[PDB]
A = this chain, B = another copy of it.
Amino acid sequence: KTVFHLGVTEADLNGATLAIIPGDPARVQKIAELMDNPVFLASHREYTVYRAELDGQSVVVCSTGIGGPSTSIAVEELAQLGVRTFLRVGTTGAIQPHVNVGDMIVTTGSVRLDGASLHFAPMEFPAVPDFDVATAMKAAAQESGATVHMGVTASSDTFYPGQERYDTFTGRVVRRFQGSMKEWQDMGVLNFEMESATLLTMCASSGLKAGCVAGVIINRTQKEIPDHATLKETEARSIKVVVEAARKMLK
């Protein structure tokens, strides 16, 4: 009926069983407006919640905030309200030279460099998406005309040392993460982000269907600064694609 953080009721969702979950609350309205009859439901913390209609079916759009902990609350409370399918959308940097700005990445599995995933399953468990959601996201991404990469994402509880960034206050990275970016590159890992391991582990171990798609807005290996136009296009394409993937999931 009611939940602790999101500030919405089951009735507010109008029967929605699918949610699109961007990280940034400011993206929620933009995603909702790509669909029919978008309606603002609530805003509390990093959780801005909208409802809309896609081919006549109710869909929820709910922001997650940054990182696994924030995400885990949103996913749990949406599930309490009857949501069973979760589509993560965002933009990301790439760490493979062959991945270009404007390409899309659909995560087939996540390196669990997080903590919240361990609150749902031990480390041996794979942070893997639902096959139907990954399939729908691949299809929507390819149909957009983008170049699409299916592969592993490294999911870090930090933006800085866990992504082996040295341009920081201390300039230090803990032993665990020293040399780690080259390690992941050599293992074929496509990109870093900060929520997929928690999202995918939590869902795959809880009877929920989840997947992640993202537009590439920077490549860590390519200093060339992308153009504002290509970036705007990439942001817009990522949410168009996640909406099309949701359409493919509706039953």
Q: Residues on A close to B: CB < 8 A?
A: 4-5, 23-26, 45-46, 65-70, 72-73, 76, 79-80, 113-116, 118-122, 156-162, 168-170, 172, 174-177, 194, 198, 206-207
Contacts and interface: CB of A to CB of B under 8 A. Distances in A.
Given A66-B73, A70-B66, A169-B79, A162 B46 contact: no
Contact of A116 (B65, B115, B176): B115
Contacts of A113: 115
14 contacts: A46-B65, A46-B70, A66-B67, A67-B68, A67-B70, A69-B70, A69-B156, A72-B157, A72-B160, A73-B159, A76-B160, A114-B115, A114-B157, A116-B158
A119 to B, nearest CB: 4
Nearest to A116: B157
Contacts of A72: 157-160
B206 A69 contact: no
A125 to B, nearest CB: 10
Contacts of A170: 206-207
Contacts of A114: 69, 115, 157
B70 A65 contact: yes
Nearest to A167: B80
A122 B176 CA distance: 8
